[PDB]
Amino acid sequence: SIAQARKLVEQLKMEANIDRIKVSKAAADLMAYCEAHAKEDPLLTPVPASENPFRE
Template identity: 45%
Template structure:
């Protein structure tokens, strides 16, 4: 069986957790919401505006500027 101090600690921990949940819900309630259709349009506009600098879409200007290229190995003959 649990003693009274364990029960008290459990109640305090549970109460603290409940307060944190309420605080988080209050923060989320204050977030400005927009329609999904508007968010999708915003994302499309952002992608189109930044397309020229997007290496995944446009590629790298030279092989050496690609940080993901395979490194050449040096071999001695």
């Protein structure tokens, strides 16, 4: 009851204390990580079946 509400208020304080950043910067970071490791993703660029261990 009272303790639960106090814990919730403290938790919201802790959540508010963080330093949020712009959507643009996070989106740029995500896009850069996607492009940088594009070659590391066989699922995106179809690797030749010779290299693909799961080849038929």
